[PDB]
Write a protein that binds this ligand. Structure first.
Ligand code: UDB
Ligand code: ZN
Length: 185
């Protein structure tokens, strides 16, 4: 069972490396890791389990965050009230196209690997198309917009050694870009 102790902290060199492509099929150990990454997210969203093991409520996790430099991610976003929810374990995900229009969370972002809040807007693409493999090596193509697009971009960034605060404007951290969509949390 993964917990907060498995999550490495900002400053750990693995978080700044470029994660390696997975060869398909995955090994059993790689499947188990990816399943446990999702299970961490499932556990973190269960009120009682999260309380018992001191878990922060997570919507995404990238393998580098548990010190595994491999291009795998898990995303678990519960129903936003519209019936849309996102439960994906992705292997070698890649943004193949995106909107020019940007989007941002109004209060900025945070990260399982970052202890202290960092104020400032993180502009990402409002719309993205991702190609990836699933855990069994089958093909997945996702068309994403708004909040889930932001989450997936955040996770893919981890695979390239990019941290959310890298995107914050030092002088004008709270100024939205022209025509950027404010995305409701
Ligand atoms: C850093 C943390 C606060 C744990 C964040 N969770 C989060 O925002 N959860 C959340 C918010 C809600 F409004 C309702 C709800 F059910 C859960 C998160 O998991 N991540 C994932 C991460 O660390 N990926 O590497 C950070 C998010 C900030 C923007 C996208 C991902
Ligand atoms: Zn993160």
């Amino acid at each position: 069972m993964l917990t907060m102790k498995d999550i490495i902290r900002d400053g750990h060199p693995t978080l700044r490396q470029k994660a390696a492509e997975l060869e398909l099929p995955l090994t059993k150990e790689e499947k188990e890791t990816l399943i446990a990454m999702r299970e961490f997210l499932v556990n973190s969203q269960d009120e009682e389990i999260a309380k018992r093991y001191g878990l922060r409520s997570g919507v995404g996790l990238a393998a580098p965050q548990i010190n595994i430099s491999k291009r795998m991610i898990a995303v678990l976003i519960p129903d936003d009230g519209s019936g849309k929810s996102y439960d994906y374990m992705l292997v070698n995900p890649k943004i193949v196209s995106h909107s020019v229009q940007e989007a941002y969370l109004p209060t900025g972002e945070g990260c399982l690997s970052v202890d202290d809040n960092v104020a400032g807007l993180v502009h990402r693409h409002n719309r993205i198309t991702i190609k990836a493999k699933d855990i069994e090596g089958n093909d997945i193509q996702l068309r994403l917009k708004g909040y889930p697009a932001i989450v997936f971009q955040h996770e893919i960034d981890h695979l390239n050694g990019v941290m959310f605060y890298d995107h914050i404007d030092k002088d004008h951290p709270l100024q939205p870009h022209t025509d950027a969509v404010e995305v409701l949390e």
